[PDB]
Amino acid sequence: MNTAYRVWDGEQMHYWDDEGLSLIIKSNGDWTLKRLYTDVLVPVVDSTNRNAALMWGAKVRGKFIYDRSIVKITSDDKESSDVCEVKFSDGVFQVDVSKYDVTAVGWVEYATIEVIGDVYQNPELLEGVK
Protein backbone atom coordinates (compact mmCIF):
# COMPACT_ATOMS: atom_id res chain seq x y z
CA MET A 1 0.00 0.00 0.00
CA ASN A 2 1.34 3.39 -1.11
CA THR A 3 -1.12 5.45 0.83
CA ALA A 4 0.81 6.33 4.01
CA TYR A 5 1.12 10.08 4.40
CA ARG A 6 1.04 12.71 7.13
CA VAL A 7 0.17 16.38 7.14
CA TRP A 8 1.35 19.15 9.37
CA ASP A 9 -1.34 21.80 9.69
CA GLY A 10 1.07 23.96 11.65
CA GLU A 11 0.05 23.13 15.19
CA GLN A 12 -0.19 19.35 15.13
CA MET A 13 0.85 16.32 13.07
CA HIS A 14 -1.76 14.29 11.18
CA TYR A 15 -1.37 10.64 10.25
CA TRP A 16 -3.32 9.13 7.33
CA ASP A 17 -4.84 6.39 9.53
CA ASP A 18 -6.16 8.88 12.10
CA GLU A 19 -9.91 8.35 12.37
CA GLY A 20 -11.95 10.47 9.95
CA LEU A 21 -9.10 12.01 8.00
CA SER A 22 -9.08 11.78 4.24
CA LEU A 23 -6.57 13.41 1.92
CA ILE A 24 -7.74 14.98 -1.33
CA ILE A 25 -5.32 15.81 -4.12
CA LYS A 26 -6.74 18.09 -6.83
CA SER A 27 -6.26 18.30 -10.61
CA ASN A 28 -4.22 21.47 -10.13
CA GLY A 29 -1.78 19.73 -7.80
CA ASP A 30 -3.29 21.30 -4.68
CA TRP A 31 -4.00 19.08 -1.69
CA THR A 32 -6.42 19.36 1.23
CA LEU A 33 -6.67 17.40 4.46
CA LYS A 34 -10.28 16.66 5.44
CA ARG A 35 -11.88 15.33 8.61
CA LEU A 36 -15.31 13.75 9.04
CA TYR A 37 -17.13 15.23 12.05
CA THR A 38 -20.81 14.33 11.69
CA ASP A 39 -21.88 13.62 8.11
CA VAL A 40 -19.93 16.71 7.11
CA LEU A 41 -16.38 16.78 5.72
CA VAL A 42 -14.38 19.50 7.46
CA PRO A 43 -11.29 21.29 6.06
CA VAL A 44 -8.52 20.82 8.63
CA VAL A 45 -5.66 22.43 6.71
CA ASP A 46 -4.82 23.05 3.06
CA SER A 47 -1.87 23.36 0.66
CA THR A 48 -2.45 27.08 -0.01
CA ASN A 49 -1.37 27.49 3.63
CA ARG A 50 2.38 27.98 3.09
CA ASN A 51 3.02 26.97 6.70
CA ALA A 52 1.48 23.53 6.27
CA ALA A 53 3.18 20.42 4.89
CA LEU A 54 2.37 17.03 3.31
CA MET A 55 4.88 14.15 3.81
CA TRP A 56 4.63 10.73 2.21
CA GLY A 57 5.45 7.48 3.90
CA ALA A 58 7.64 4.75 2.49
CA LYS A 59 7.26 1.20 3.64
CA VAL A 60 10.78 0.08 4.52
CA ARG A 61 12.05 -2.16 7.32
CA GLY A 62 8.41 -3.19 7.65
CA LYS A 63 7.82 0.33 8.98
CA PHE A 64 6.79 3.69 7.51
CA ILE A 65 9.18 6.64 7.57
CA TYR A 66 8.21 10.05 6.20
CA ASP A 67 10.46 13.14 6.60
CA ARG A 68 11.77 12.39 10.07
CA SER A 69 15.01 12.90 11.98
CA ILE A 70 16.69 9.59 12.72
CA VAL A 71 19.65 8.18 14.62
CA LYS A 72 21.91 6.13 12.36
CA ILE A 73 24.11 4.05 14.71
CA THR A 74 26.70 1.76 13.12
CA SER A 75 26.00 -1.92 13.68
CA ASP A 76 29.68 -2.17 14.55
CA ASP A 77 30.17 -0.30 17.89
CA LYS A 78 29.68 3.49 18.26
CA GLU A 79 31.93 3.57 15.21
CA SER A 80 29.20 5.67 13.67
CA SER A 81 26.06 7.43 14.80
CA ASP A 82 24.38 10.62 13.70
CA VAL A 83 21.17 12.57 13.46
CA CYS A 84 20.22 13.10 9.82
CA GLU A 85 16.95 14.32 8.37
CA VAL A 86 15.18 11.86 6.08
CA LYS A 87 14.49 13.54 2.75
CA PHE A 88 12.42 12.46 -0.25
CA SER A 89 14.18 13.61 -3.42
CA ASP A 90 15.14 12.26 -6.86
CA GLY A 91 12.59 9.51 -6.34
CA VAL A 92 14.22 8.16 -3.19
CA PHE A 93 13.98 8.58 0.58
CA GLN A 94 17.61 9.31 1.36
CA VAL A 95 19.77 10.17 4.39
CA ASP A 96 23.28 11.51 5.01
CA VAL A 97 25.49 8.48 5.46
CA SER A 98 28.84 10.13 6.12
CA LYS A 99 29.05 7.72 9.05
CA TYR A 100 28.79 7.15 0.73
CA ASP A 101 27.23 10.51 1.59
CA VAL A 102 23.59 9.82 0.75
CA THR A 103 21.67 6.57 0.29
CA ALA A 104 18.18 5.11 0.48
CA VAL A 105 17.11 4.74 4.11
CA GLY A 106 16.09 1.19 3.24
CA TRP A 107 19.56 0.52 1.83
CA VAL A 108 21.52 1.45 4.96
CA GLU A 109 23.87 -1.54 4.98
CA TYR A 110 26.03 -1.75 8.11
CA ALA A 111 23.74 0.35 10.29
CA THR A 112 20.52 0.40 12.30
CA ILE A 113 18.14 3.35 11.83
CA GLU A 114 15.80 4.57 14.56
CA VAL A 115 13.21 7.33 14.12
CA ILE A 116 13.40 9.90 16.92
CA GLY A 117 11.25 12.72 15.53
CA ASP A 118 10.69 15.12 12.63
CA VAL A 119 11.94 18.50 11.44
CA TYR A 120 8.56 20.02 12.34
CA GLN A 121 8.11 18.86 15.94
CA ASN A 122 11.85 18.73 16.77
CA PRO A 123 13.39 21.64 14.81
CA GLU A 124 16.25 21.66 17.29
CA LEU A 125 17.16 17.96 17.27
CA LEU A 126 19.58 18.38 14.38
CA GLU A 127 22.43 19.46 16.69
CA GLY A 128 24.91 19.07 19.53
CA VAL A 129 25.44 15.30 20.00
CA LYS A 130 27.46 13.79 22.85
Chain positions contacting a second copy, by CB under 8 A: 1-5, 16-31, 54-56, 58-60, 65, 88, 90-93, 104-107
Residues with Cβ within 8 Å of 116's Cβ and at least 6 positions away in sequence, in order, are 68, 69, 70, 71, 83, 122, 125
Min separation Cβ 41 and a second copy, Å? 10
Looking at the Cβ atoms of 97 and 105, the one nearer to a second copy is 105
Min separation Cβ 130 and a second copy, Å? 29
Looking at the Cβ atoms of 107 and 110, the one nearer to a second copy is 107
**Nearest-5° angle of CA 128, CA 107, CA 102?**
50
Three-class SS state of 39:
coil
Looking at the Cβ atoms of 29 and 128, the one nearer to a second copy is 29
Min separation Cβ 105 and a second copy, Å? 6
Instruction: Say how far apart CA 82 and CA 126 lie, in whole Å.
Output: 9
